[PDB]
Amino acid sequence: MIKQRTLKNIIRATGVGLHSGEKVYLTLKPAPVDTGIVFSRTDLDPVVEIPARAENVGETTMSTTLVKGDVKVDTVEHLLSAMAGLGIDNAYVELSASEVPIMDGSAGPFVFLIQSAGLQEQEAAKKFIRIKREVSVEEGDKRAVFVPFDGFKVSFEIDFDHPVFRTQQASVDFSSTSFVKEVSRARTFGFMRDIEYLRSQNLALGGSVENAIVVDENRVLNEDGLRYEDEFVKHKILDAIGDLYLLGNSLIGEFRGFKSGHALNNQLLRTLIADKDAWEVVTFEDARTAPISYMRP
Numbered sequence: 001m002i003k004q005r006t007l008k009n010i011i012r013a014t015g016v017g018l019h020s021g022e023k024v025y026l027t028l029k030p031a032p033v034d035t036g037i038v039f040s041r042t043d044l045d046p047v048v049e050i051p052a053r054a055e056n057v058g059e060t061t062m063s064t065t066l067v068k069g070d071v072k073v074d075t076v077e078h079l080l081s082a083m084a085g086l087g088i089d090n091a092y093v094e095l096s097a098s099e100v101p102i103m104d105g106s107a108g109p110f111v112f113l114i115q116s117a118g119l120q121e122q123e124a125a126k127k128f129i130r131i132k133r134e135v136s137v138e139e140g141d142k143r144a145v146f147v148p149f150d151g152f153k154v155s156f157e158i159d160f161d162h163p164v165f166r167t168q169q170a171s172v173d174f175s176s177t178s179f180v181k182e183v184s185r186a187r188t189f190g191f192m193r194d195i196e197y198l199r200s201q202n203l204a205l206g207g208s209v210e211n212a213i214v215v216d217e218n219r220v221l222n223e224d225g226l227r228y229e230d231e232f233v234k235h236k237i238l239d240a241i242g243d244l245y246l247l248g249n250s251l252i253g254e255f256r257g258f259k260s261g262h263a264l265n266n267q268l269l270r271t272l273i274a275d276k277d278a279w280e281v282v283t284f285e286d287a288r289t290a291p292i293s294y295m296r297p
């Protein structure tokens with residue numbers, strides 16, 4: 001029987017918000033069965049908790065933000081990506097400030113910290129959202145789709161008219177490939193002319209070559225370049241896996257992104273949730289016949 005997972009031990013990390021530039025103390029705690037991923041602003045009195053669910057997603061343009069009243073948690077997608085990748089169902093994420101720390105701009109540091117601490121199987125069936133019908137959303141030339149698939153796979157395409165863009169297309173079947181190996185280390189990227197604008201608007205305050213691929217007109221400015229030839233589209237898949245986990249359960253299905261980002265990802269989740277014909281919740285009493293498997297805890 002495929003069991004729910006939480007953390008074996010507490011994880012503590014320190015970092016900077018990409019946008020806020022604020023120093024932030026992060027604590028990941030075990031949580032009981034059927035808790036889900038709950039973010040917790042522990043710098044406030046009282047403490048403000050926000051389940052990492054589609055219903056709590058704020059209307060911002062820079063990253064995935066969770067909101068309850070006018071309290072926010074910015075840039076949740078890379079951490080939620082790591083949680084999704086390692087099959088963590090239940091955890092409390094405590095933050096000393098409004099923004100998840102950016103770390104190296106990937107999920108690599110999160111997956112390392114979590115796998116260092118280890119994982120704990122819990123005595124309850126892991127619940128999955130199975131895609132039963134195609135659900136798509138469009139806005140201009142951008143598309144995001146859910147397709148039925150006996151497993152979990154993400155296909156992504158970006159199309160920048162830019163000398164730096166390499167393959168802009170990638171597909172990964174996670175039933176037969178590591179989230180860790182393939183996608184976790186893939187860093188966010190910023191173009192010089194966007195970074196200049198965002199800086200002029202007091203955004204990108206934490207950004208550096210240490211936590212982002214910096215792309216001018218022609219080339220990566222980072223001194224050690226790219227971690228993968230296809231790091232850009234790999235990072236888009238990382239962002240998708242993070243937004244997909246706002247469903248609050250691992251997906252049995254395929255996601256296809258074409259020039260998609262968090263706004264359209266959020267639109268897809270909300271239409272999927274609304275269309276109960278297109279999805280159901282399943283458990284697996286026998287992992288040997290399940291279409292997905294997880295790493296030894």
Ligand SMILES: O=C(NC[C@H]1C[C@@H](NC(=O)[C@@H]2C[C@H](F)CN2)CN1C(=O)C1CC1)c1ccc(C#Cc2ccc(CN3CCOCC3)cc2)c(F)c1
Binds near residue numbers: 188198
């Ligand atoms: O939002 C940024 N990139 C968005 C990229 C990545 C991807 N989205 C994601 O990954 C989502 C969104 C979040 F990124 C996380 N998940 C999709 N996407 C796009 O579609 C872009 C074409 C629009 C971004 C990244 C780094 C910095 C940065 C920075 C920075 C600022 C200053 C300096 C200092 N420089 C020193 C040298 O002289 C210039 C300044 C260095 C880096 C920044 F200001 C902005």
Ligand SMILES: [Zn+2]
Binds near residue numbers: 077
């Ligand atoms: Zn990202």
